[PDB]
Structure 1
């Protein structure tokens, strides 16, 4: 079946809790595999020790830039970027896990967790999972955001991996 992955998040060195995500490998296997391996760190690089660098209240919480920590970086397990697998899953509401990008077919490692229905991103961003547990943690992350995306606290993924 589909993998379950986790992100243990800190805000200025104090733990906020765990966000558990279901990766829709059934619909987007390439995109789900990329995220899964980046959580376990089995390819020699991944999300552990990196940040939520772009957090916007009433929109989303963006992370995944483990190379530059500023929105210009991160990489996939396949290479520096990979194609948009498909646009089958929609940005239906809060809790949606989707890929961050810089235009068509520029998927790396950067991703976001929606805090609202982001329907205008359908056909532009690849949806590949959703929050199973820890939406209270996502809401804590959100509260440390601003309109610019700048965080008021340093939000770090201290640990991440695969549950099943």
Structure 2
């Protein structure tokens, strides 16, 4: 399945790994469908590393899953941070099975993250958009100066 993250800087299209990560994918889809991510921000943007959002509070401390506060990890060797635009759940290995609503998108291969967070999709379109996002200025605390806003996350058809 494909989803489209609609931002104030353009659209990001992701392929979801339904077969491998059904729990993470179902969470992401059900939260998206219920409008849980509408008018939220990416609160952390680190060039060459990751961009993180999916907190309704926008502080980096909030958000929950459809299963409760946390849900279990779907972590596999076959899914790796081996390319730009990987879609993952925020949480690490120190505190396992602590996935909520927050997610991040990678800016490059990041082998140090392998086994640490649930990967459940990858960017398949809107690479220009991701480039734009990477170049958006942030402050000392990695918070974008001008807000990067998720308008909606929709299931892509056609």
TM-score exceeds 0.5 = yes
- CA shift digits 1:15-49 (9 cap, x unpaired): x21101111011111111111112222xxx51111
User: 1:159: Cα distance to partner?
Assistant: 2.0
Moved over 2 A (4+): 145-148
Instruction: Describe the SS at the equivalent of 2:71.
Output: coil
How many residues are aligned here? 153
State whether residues 4 and 22 of structure 1, in contact with CA within 8 Å, keep that contact through their aligned partners in structure 2: yes
State whether residues 91 and 121 of structure 1, in contact with CA within 8 Å, keep that contact through their aligned partners in structure 2: yes
Corresponding position: 1:55 with 2:45: yes
Q: Which runs of 5+ in 1 are unaligned?
A: 11-15
Corresponding position: 1:77 with 2:56: no
User: 1:128: Cα distance to partner?
Assistant: 0.5
User: 1:135: Cα distance to partner?
Assistant: 1.7
Q: What does 1:147-158 align with in structure 2 at a 5 Å threshold?
A: 148-158=141-151
Instruction: Describe the SS at the equivalent of 1:35.
Output: helix
User: 1:162: Cα distance to partner?
Assistant: 0.6
Q: What does 1:106-117 align with in structure 2 at a 5 Å threshold?
A: 106-117=98-109
Whole-Å Cα distance in 1 between the matches of residues 141 and 109 of structure 2?
20
The worse-fitting range, judged by mean Cα deviation, of 82-91 and 56-65 is 82-91
Whole-Å Cα distance in 2 between the matches of residues 63 and 139 of structure 1?
17
Question: RMSD of the alignment, in Å?
Answer: 1.4
Q: What is aligned with 2:4?
A: 6
Q: Which runs of 5+ in 2 are unaligned?
A: none
TM-score by length of 2: 0.90
State whether residues 87 and 125 of structure 1, in contact with CA within 8 Å, keep that contact through their aligned partners in structure 2: no
Q: What is aligned with 2:156?
A: 163
